[PDB]
Amino acid sequence: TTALVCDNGSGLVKAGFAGDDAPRAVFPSIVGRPRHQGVMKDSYVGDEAQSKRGILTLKYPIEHGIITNWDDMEKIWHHTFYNELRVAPEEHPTLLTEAPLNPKANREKMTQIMFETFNVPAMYVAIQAVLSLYASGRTTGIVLDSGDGVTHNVPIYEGYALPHAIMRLDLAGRDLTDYLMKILTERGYSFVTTAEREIVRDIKEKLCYVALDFENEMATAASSSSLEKSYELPDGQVITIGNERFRCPETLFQPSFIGMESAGIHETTYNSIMKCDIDIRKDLYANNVMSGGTTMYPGIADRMQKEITALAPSTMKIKIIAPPERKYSVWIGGSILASLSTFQQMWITKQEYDEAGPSIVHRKCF
Amino acid sequence: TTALVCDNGSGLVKAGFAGDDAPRAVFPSIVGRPRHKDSYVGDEAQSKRGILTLKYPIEHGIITNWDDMEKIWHHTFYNELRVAPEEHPTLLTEAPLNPKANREKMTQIMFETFNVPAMYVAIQAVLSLYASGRTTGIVLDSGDGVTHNVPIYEGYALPHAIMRLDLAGRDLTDYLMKILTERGYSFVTTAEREIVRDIKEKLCYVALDFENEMATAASSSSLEKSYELPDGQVITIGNERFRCPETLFQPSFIGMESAGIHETTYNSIMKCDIDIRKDLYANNVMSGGTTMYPGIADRMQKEITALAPSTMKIKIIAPPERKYSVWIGGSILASLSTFQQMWITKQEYDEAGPSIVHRKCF
Numbered sequence A: 001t002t003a004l005v006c007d008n009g010s011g012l013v014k015a016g017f018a019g020d021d022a023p024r025a026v027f028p029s030i031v032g033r034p035r036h037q038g039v040m041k042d043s044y045v046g047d048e049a050q051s052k053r054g055i056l057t058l059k060y061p062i063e064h065g066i067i068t069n070w071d072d073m074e075k076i077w078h079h080t081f082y083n084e085l086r087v088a089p090e091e092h093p094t095l096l097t098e099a100p101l102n103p104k105a106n107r108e109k110m111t112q113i114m115f116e117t118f119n120v121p122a123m124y125v126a127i128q129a130v131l132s133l134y135a136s137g138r139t140t141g142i143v144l145d146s147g148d149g150v151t152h153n154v155p156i157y158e159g160y161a162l163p164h165a166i167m168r169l170d171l172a173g174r175d176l177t178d179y180l181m182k183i184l185t186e187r188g189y190s191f192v193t194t195a196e197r198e199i200v201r202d203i204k205e206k207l208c209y210v211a212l213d214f215e216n217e218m219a220t221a222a223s224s225s226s227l228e229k230s231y232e233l234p235d236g237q238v239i240t241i242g243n244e245r246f247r248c249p250e251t252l253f254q255p256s257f258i259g260m261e262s263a264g265i266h267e268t269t270y271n272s273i274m275k276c277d278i279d280i281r282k283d284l285y286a287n288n289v290m291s292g293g294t295t296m297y298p299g300i301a302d303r304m305q306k307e308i309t310a311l312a313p314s315t316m317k318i319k320i321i322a323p324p325e326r327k328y329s330v331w332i333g334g335s336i337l338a339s340l341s342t343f344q345q346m347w348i349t350k351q352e353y354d355e356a357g358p359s360i361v362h363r364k365c366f
Numbered sequence B: 001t002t003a004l005v006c007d008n009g010s011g012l013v014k015a016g017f018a019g020d021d022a023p024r025a026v027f028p029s030i031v032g033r034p035r036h037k038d039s040y041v042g043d044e045a046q047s048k049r050g051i052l053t054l055k056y057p058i059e060h061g062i063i064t065n066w067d068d069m070e071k072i073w074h075h076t077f078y079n080e081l082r083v084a085p086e087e088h089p090t091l092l093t094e095a096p097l098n099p100k101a102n103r104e105k106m107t108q109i110m111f112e113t114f115n116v117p118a119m120y121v122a123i124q125a126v127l128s129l130y131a132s133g134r135t136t137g138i139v140l141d142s143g144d145g146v147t148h149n150v151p152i153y154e155g156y157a158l159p160h161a162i163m164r165l166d167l168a169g170r171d172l173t174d175y176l177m178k179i180l181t182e183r184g185y186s187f188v189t190t191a192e193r194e195i196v197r198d199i200k201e202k203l204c205y206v207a208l209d210f211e212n213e214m215a216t217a218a219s220s221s222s223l224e225k226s227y228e229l230p231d232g233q234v235i236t237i238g239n240e241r242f243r244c245p246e247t248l249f250q251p252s253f254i255g256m257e258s259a260g261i262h263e264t265t266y267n268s269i270m271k272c273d274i275d276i277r278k279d280l281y282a283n284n285v286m287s288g289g290t291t292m293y294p295g296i297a298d299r300m301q302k303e304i305t306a307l308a309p310s311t312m313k314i315k316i317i318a319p320p321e322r323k324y325s326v327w328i329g330g331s332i333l334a335s336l337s338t339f340q341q342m343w344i345t346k347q348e349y350d351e352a353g354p355s356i357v358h359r360k361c362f
Ligand SMILES: Nc1ncnc2c1ncn2[C@@H]1O[C@H](COP(=O)(O)OP(=O)(O)OP(=O)(O)O)[C@@H](O)[C@H]1O
Pocket: A008, A009, A010, A011, A012, A013, A064, A065, A146, A147, A148, A149, A150, A151, A172, A173, A174, A201, A204, A205, A206, A291, A292, A293, A294, A295, A296, A297, A327
């Protein structure tokens, strides 16, 4: 009996089979329906909704990690089981993930749908950051999770997230793509359409990096061509990318670049640690673990180590852990968790759900 | 707000307040009712035994008489602890392999009969293990009514591997009575049973080599101890001292064909995966009143060494507190910050019902 792991994000669904080192299916968390359906019942999910976007209204059922459109979330889950993983959900225990401050009612609804619409034999809901931390081989540390829609700091002590100390930055991967489009248009190129967004996304993921000292790099890029990289557009046209390589992800450290007054990710990290008890801060500073697609920039751990060092006590041991496989560490932590012997008894079974109802899900220990 | 901890056993209730180092209330787990209405509990039921029919609501650790158990809980709250139970979260304990229906009924009664604001049910052996500073190990819990081995891996009792010996302290008392009577004394009445219990708890010990000690005992008087009876007669107890608890290792002494406590320990380990066997062998924790005999840890060490692979590191931990370690584990646990999260609340119970209790995590 193979368990399933589904990590539902704001931008991407990551789904697959417990025991694997990577999600088998990764696709856009988008549902499309024909314009004016409901005021006048077809629907499309992920790459297909995107490819058929022309007369569909496209929606993201999860916003900042939290499910907000239930009907469309059902379509995402259905598609995930039957089209992407090609499984009968009633044959498999299914681990799902949730965002840092997911309301109880939300968790209960997810639970009801899994058992009553999908008929899963068993399920579990884990905190995304705790899974990432587990994947890094720890039960204590502070997770920076930067995805497509939202960025969170989640301090965890001996297995337990500290909810009072969670910090949020309302910017992540999709904002960085849009800003790369903006500033790259400003050079003289034109990146504005949805096809051009796809290209820009590929540039972001291939050529961007976090500057160790931002002002030294701006100067270098202005002095020399040494920081410049070639890039071939789908049509064979080669173009050149300079300081926008590192200005784009600089937004995480300086959200003012997209007109936001929020604290950059180094500040959210510090702030989150400072909300925690002095007795555990040393442990958190030494176990700063980065996760999510938007932590993937070369140079980001180096830059964070520099910033945290500036904010923290002079003698604090600081360490930033950025695992190569951090892009899907939330999913991989789930894969690990759902595969080990000790967790077998942690699943919530259909019989338990039948006797207790959905609030059974809250009594949870991973 | 102070949480209550009630560890209900077959022979004794141990009850008190979390944060305390020991239970404030320890009394017999007995309810008496007139022979032909009022019921009495514990010491008062005993003082009235001549006009009451006395019953033990818990047998081998499992609650079997529910009306009488409700009387014990009521008396514990109101008369022993002097608390209104609707003002305190309450941690209760349970036997290994306590049935699900039983655990649910306990929960129902706490919320619906005693109106507790919150409660929890913890496995006795897990609490003992926790009190000793461990989350993996094998507990031997020997009480008044039953003996169990409970192997525990990272906080979780492994139910397929739990072993039981249907003899414990009350059996050893009776047996001491019998063999003292055979020596020529006579201990038959209930008054004489209390005397013999005192002798058992004061003068018995577990021999390292039984057959050597018997030979020593017949040889000289060097193992004889004097004991003043309440009336002031001084009697002599000899190989009595160690024959009595030898029953733990040799249940045949009282006509039982079951495995002794060294064999149940070993058998329990061997029902567990090889992956954790070394850690179990190194972390044998003794708990319960009937593990108090001087000599018992050394004798276990010997017996387990003989059964285990010759190279295996063996360690038997017998905390001086072990008579109340279940209770003390509960006290420690219920005082922790992170435990406030783990209580089942009345609102949770109202939403889910009694089956909510099983998703426990202590
Ligand atoms: N190598 C990379 N470099 C930079 N960005 C990347 C890289 N790989 C992925 N990303 C970005 O990461 C984002 C997807 O990450 P992730 O799956 O962690 O987010 P999510 O779970 O969908 O969203 P959220 O956690 O905000 O709800 C996309 O914006 C993607 O463009």
